[PDB]
Design an enzyme around this catalytic site. Structure first.
Site, PDB file in Angstrom:
ATOM      1  NE  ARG A  94     -23.219  20.026 -50.650  1.00 22.17           N
ATOM      2  CZ  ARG A  94     -23.881  21.128 -50.301  1.00 22.17           C
ATOM      3  NH1 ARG A  94     -23.232  22.269 -50.077  1.00 22.17           N
ATOM      4  NH2 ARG A  94     -25.203  21.087 -50.175  1.00 22.17           N
TER       5      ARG A  94
ATOM      6  CE  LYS B 134     -20.365  32.129 -46.450  1.00 26.49           C
ATOM      7  NZ  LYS B 134     -20.753  31.107 -47.498  1.00 26.49           N
TER       8      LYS B 134
HETATM    9  O1  OXL Z   1     -23.709  29.058 -43.592  1.00 26.78           O
HETATM   10  C1  OXL Z   1     -24.227  30.123 -44.039  1.00 26.78           C
HETATM   11  O2  OXL Z   1     -25.192  30.770 -43.518  1.00 26.78           O
HETATM   12  C2  OXL Z   1     -23.598  30.676 -45.368  1.00 26.78           C
HETATM   13  O3  OXL Z   1     -22.668  29.998 -45.799  1.00 26.78           O
HETATM   14  O4  OXL Z   1     -24.049  31.737 -45.914  1.00 26.78           O
HETATM   15 MG    MG Z   2     -20.795  28.656 -50.423  1.00 17.12          MG
END
Ligand code: OXL
Ligand code: MG
Ligand code: FBP
Ligand code: FBP
Ligand code: FBP
Ligand code: OXL
Ligand code: OXL
Ligand code: K
Ligand code: K
Ligand code: K
Ligand code: MG
Ligand code: MG
Lengths: 518, 518, 518
Positions: free
Chosen positions: C107, C257
């Site tokens: 970030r 993820k």
């Molecule tokens: O990057 C994305 O879509 C998340 O982190 O949910």
């Molecule tokens: Mg997150």
């Protein structure tokens, strides 16, 4: 609606079945080749003419019997009969000649002198097997002599031995060094020189015997179209046959006969090395449990269909017709199901070789085959053949599949194919179109060999070669057009598919046209 | 590989076929019912016991021959033989009794001087058919007396007349008031009292004659389980048989035999009014072209499979075994293909009623059926039966389909079903599970009738009723559990599906459990 | 016609499409779980109550923002709102809590002065990136501080750098020691602490950093139901997370993820180690070409459906609704196709966390999901799920498949499943029935985690365990009965499926009953 087209449109095989209609007449063309064994009942030039008229496409000569003089005469009569129709190329039907080898057979000697003599064996009784040629003429309910000399080396106590189409059975009770003491299981009338099977026993006879060598040389001399090799057990057996036929017999097709357990087990090897397969159910059904035959039959037809190689269903298809003019319900069924299974050809043996109704047997196979062909569920069949066929960039193959797809789209009256070697027509047939494939060739041998393939109607053009190649091509296409019209396959209005090549010589088929019959 | 499970997993039917393996042995359970015709060769208590041991599930009585006295003694012997096994409920095999009506049969009279020593009929000769009773026992090569008094009114010059299983054919050359002069087409030997068929004529004999009524009522008195009604041509014929059976015979199943063109044309109407169907190929293959029989057979099996009603494939399935201890290859194929087609039962007629090898014939059908059942392509079959099956808010149907789905998922050793009337088991059977359906009932008639359905093994529970219904249900479940183990269907570790209902009485099956064998 | 049933009966997928009807209203039950990100716009207890009423099933806490103190209060609010409905178990809806880790993200720092302040970035201009902490709070159009210390070591001259959801793109011109002179390719307003992506670069940040460790232990302490692990690249990353959650958090579900190229390449090993998957398209569509994201999405939903593990489609589904009360046409299409693809849950991020229309966004996902669920071609889906369903002997599995098959047969109103751990209900959902699965449990966590599975409507029974086990079972079944009726899933005369076991404890589900709703 004809040719079961209502059933053809079903979305499930079950509904397809539900739609089969005995009041829905099939087309004129019959796609499955019919192979007839020629013998005493069908040997004459006169009767052969009727055999051809009734539907015979291949004449099978069984070399497990008869001399070379005998077979040479049969062959001569077959050709005389076949050429009596040659004066009209449009209607001429080529007829192939097939030599079915004796192969590693085991047989018995003569009964009480007379070859016509018969000893009726008593069940539970005993029987001694002699390898002493002194008895090879002295056979009766007590002493039986066999051809196989090494029989004792492969059989054990408990083992069974079948004689004469496996009806008469025997159980090996006492094994000697040159003798066998057995007990009759379910005897009966025993004639002389009958076939013997040793199930489970690994017989050691030669792939190609001395007699077989003699016969194969004869086949080449007589210009036969194919050889049905008996008792093929492995790929090396096929290779021996190939090598023996050698250079001179290089264009003769080898159809391996699968009739024992080892042949089934090593089927993939055998098929790869062969030009086609015969499901020889007579010996097969003695060699393995009779109840397992349909399994071996469907397995082999399926694999041959997948490979695009000819497969013949043979033996006892219309057995009862050896004596009666009509077949039993099981026989009508067997013929229909062999065609539904996917067999390229169906065969007759004793039914045409020696029976009382040879012509009726041929006509019945023609009738049943045609009705069965219309009942095939092409929707599923064509889809599975397409998905299961190796992927390739061969132009001829792409043309072949596109023609079959086009033929289904417009319900064509035929697929016309010009071919020198027969290959282009074979490529179309492996996709199993409903429409007949009129294969036009100038090669008389490819015309005769083409009968091994489902749906190929070989047509032999005798026209001289036109100087302008394009006209020579149109001349052959028109010849096919004429054949189709004369045979009732189609008429002037109809639409037909025509396959040709871009240049002279084999291997260049790449052109597909949808044309109306002139 | 066992029970062709490698072939079972094929993604296409063609590959399924390619995988059929003669070295993949089937399970012990044989699903297809075997119906045996009882006669001189199989009437004794002693051979009936072996018939049962060999696999007979239903005893068929052919009322085209014999007196009520004769048939009552046959029935008594069947029950004596069957009950000789009753002392052990776990091993006891229920055996049904079927009455097969004479119906509108046409038969010839007796040959003169020797009421069986046949007269020879030759192609081209002339033969006069008379209705003058002075010749009813004086039939010969020149004059033939027949049964049907109105034959002259329904036939015309040019009509074809078939005699003796359609083996002899005649063409009417001249028509008279009480006679017909005919010319022999297919000749052969004519014996006494042979069957006659008039294809294409509209014979006006009643579907149910006064004799048929007498026999049907006798069937009720004798407590038969089912009726095979000959020559059913339309639904009203079926209703007529229903009425004759009446209130006392209301639970007797009616199987309409389809054996003429009209029966096939009005099949749907007949099926709806019947409890099941018999493809009676003998007359059917005389009534319509022999080459069309397989079409009618597959249509009817498919439609009854779609309706969940039992269908029987019959006649000449192992014909040659009337005289030989082993069947032809066409017969082995026929039995296997009938099962693959989806027939609930297969049948024997001459093979068991009078042949020399009744026991061998039964055993062969047992062997072939079991091999063929393993070769079925359940993957496609179940899928199609589901899609084609009428959706409904009926709980029992939903339970049945879920049990079959579950049986495939865990390759269960069986689907156990408690049933009073047999309905819950029939509902499971129509989905064609691979696993056997053990139907537990205390109703002896439903135990015998259950044999009409593919895959149902009926077991008759004799245990007294428990006061606590839950315990009575568990008692019946354990009984099935015991039968399966003693029968070798499954072992202590295996998983089984079990169907029960929410309250006593018929029509409440709604519970499916996946339970391990105790 | 309702719930696209006409389309459901379609025999082909194309006809299914042709029959979709905007005038066929769907059923009340919505099967796809809705996951909402909580933030300033949806954090209040009062707003949370509305989120739940609108359809929220899972509350997602984004840990790449906010302190533990802040999230702990969010969780507290989610539970206060959820329990405000606890006084009526029949209508109470369980709500889960998911912890989404910050993970290895990059970030920027804070823009000059204010924390809301932004700067304009013009195309072609140069921008310098520094790692010198002196500027972490002085970010502006000329100098941008990032928190990835090794950035200069993984990037090259020409490398592309994306900032703020990949909307700002930068190209590296000069690679400096601890700085980068870049050229702005795509301009726009830069804010504070925005996400940065380095597509192609091998970023070496830890899968599980020290802060992630702390947040994960916080999750265990806070009793969260599942963890959404960011940037998972391989199985060992998943194992690290599992070890951190450890023994005490062994029941917390790990949803990996997938948002980078490696996670996609090593997907199979990641899935095997995980409890579920989230298709994190925000980062994924930056890490890989935007045009390939749909390929990765459909591959992941497909493979998860195949393995029976939960899959979440996430990010920018209703993006425009962050500012507008209605979605774009592409957004409506995206939610619908995620459901048709087979996603167990769909998610909202900025739309609920900070948007101006959180409630409307949730309502829209509920509306679209329900319409899409009815549009699924179950005929093909169920058949393919079964065909591809592994071969097992697990009783619970066979019961689950049997129940789904039965639910289709009678169009049941629901499949009621009693479950302790939720496994039994998970097993049913993997077969994708059209009917809703009412999972009745006493375990609050299982009730919460059940939302991860398409079609499971979790219901928490609060009644005390009844002395007698049978009545306790019936009590729980009747509870589900009341739930279904109160929510309008079904009514008194409806037929539903009920799954229970034969004894207390998990792993014993084996009973299926078809019953009318009381
Ligand atoms: O990057 C994305 O879509 C998340 O982190 O949910
Ligand atoms: Mg997150
Ligand atoms: O099937 P084959 O043996 O490959 O023959 C098909 C070949 O015959 C052709 O139609 C040519 O015919 P001709 O050489 O007989 O004139 C080609 O164009 C084609 O390559
Ligand atoms: O198949 P049917 O005739 O409907 O019988 C199944 C019936 O039998 C049952 O198991 C009941 O048995 P009893 O009535 O106990 O034989 C029911 O619960 C069920 O309704
Ligand atoms: O899905 P799970 O966790 O295996 O639970 C299903 C289990 O719950 C049951 O309905 C039992 O319930 P309880 O143990 O809570 O009484 C069993 O009969 C079944 O085995
Ligand atoms: O040789 C044959 O044809 C046979 O055995 O069937
Ligand atoms: O009656 C029969 O069974 C027949 O005709 O086949
Ligand atoms: K042979
Ligand atoms: K009859
Ligand atoms: K993110
Ligand atoms: Mg031979
Ligand atoms: Mg009769």
């Amino acid at each position: 609606q004809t040719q079961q087209l209502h059933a053809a449109m079903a979305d499930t095989f079950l509904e397809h079945m539900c739609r089969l209609d005995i009041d829905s007449p099939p087309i004129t063309a019959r796609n499955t080749g019919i192979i007839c064994t020629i013998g005493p009942a069908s040997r004459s030039v006169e009767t052969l003419k009727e055999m051809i008229k009734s539907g015979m496409n291949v004449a099978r000569l069984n070399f497990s019997h008869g001399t070379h003089e005998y077979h040479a005469e049969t062959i001569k009569n077959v050709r005389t009969a076949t050429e009596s129709f040659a004066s009209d190329p449009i209607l001429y039907r080529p007829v192939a000649v097939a030599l079915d080898t004796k192969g590693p057979e085991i047989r018995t000697g003569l009964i009480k002198g007379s070859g016509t003599a018969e000893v009726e064996l008593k069940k539970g009784a005993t029987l001694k097997i002699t390898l002493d040629n002194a008895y090879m003429e002295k056979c009766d309910e007590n002493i039986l002599w066999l051809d196989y000399k090494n029989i004792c080396k492969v059989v054990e106590v408990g083992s069974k031995i079948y004689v004469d189409d496996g009806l008469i059975s025997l159980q090996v009770k006492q094994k000697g060094a040159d003798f066998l003491v057995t007990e009759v299981e379910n005897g009966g009338s025993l004639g002389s020189k009958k076939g013997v099977n040793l199930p489970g026993a690994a017989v050691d006879l030669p792939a190609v015997s001395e007699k077989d060598i003699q016969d194969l040389k004869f086949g080449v001399e007589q210009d036969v179209d194919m050889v049905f090799a008996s008792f093929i057990r492995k790929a090396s057996d096929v290779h021996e046959v190939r090598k023996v036929l050698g250079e001179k017999g290089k264009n003769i097709k080898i159809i391996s006969k699968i009739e024992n357990h080892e042949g089934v087990r090593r089927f993939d090897e055998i098929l790869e090395a062969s030009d086609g397969i015969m499901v020889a159910r007579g010996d097969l059904g003695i060699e393995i449990p009779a109840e397992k035959v349909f399994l071996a039959q469907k397995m082999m037809i399926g694999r041959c269909n997948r490979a695009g190689k000819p497969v013949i269903c043979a033996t006892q298809m219309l057995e009862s017709m050896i004596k009666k003019p009509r077949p039993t319900r099981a026989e009508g069924s067997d013929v229909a199901n062999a065609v539904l299974d996917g067999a390229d050809c169906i065969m007759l043996s004793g039914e045409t070789a020696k029976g009382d109704y040879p012509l009726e047997a041929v006509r019945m196979q023609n009738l049943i085959a045609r009705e069965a062909e219309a009942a095939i569920y092409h929707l599923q069949l064509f889809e599975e053949l397409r998905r299961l066929a190796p992927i390739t960039s061969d132009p001829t193959e792409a043309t072949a599949v596109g023609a079959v797809e086009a033929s289904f789209k417009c319900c064509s009256g035929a697929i016309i194919v010009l071919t020198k070697s027969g290959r282009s027509a074979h490529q179309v047939a492996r996709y199993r179109p409903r429409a007949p494939i009129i294969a036009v060739t100038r090669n008389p041998q490819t015309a005769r060999q083409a009968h091994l393939y489902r749906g190929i109607f070989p047509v032999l053009c005798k026209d001289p070669v036109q100087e302008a190649w394009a006209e020579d091509v149109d001349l052959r296409v028109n010849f096919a057009m004429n054949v189709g019209k004369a045979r009732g396959f189609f008429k002037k209005g109809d639409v037909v598919i025509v396959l040709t090549g871009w240049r002279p010589g084999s291997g260049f088929t790449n052109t597909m046209r949808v044309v109306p019959v002139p």
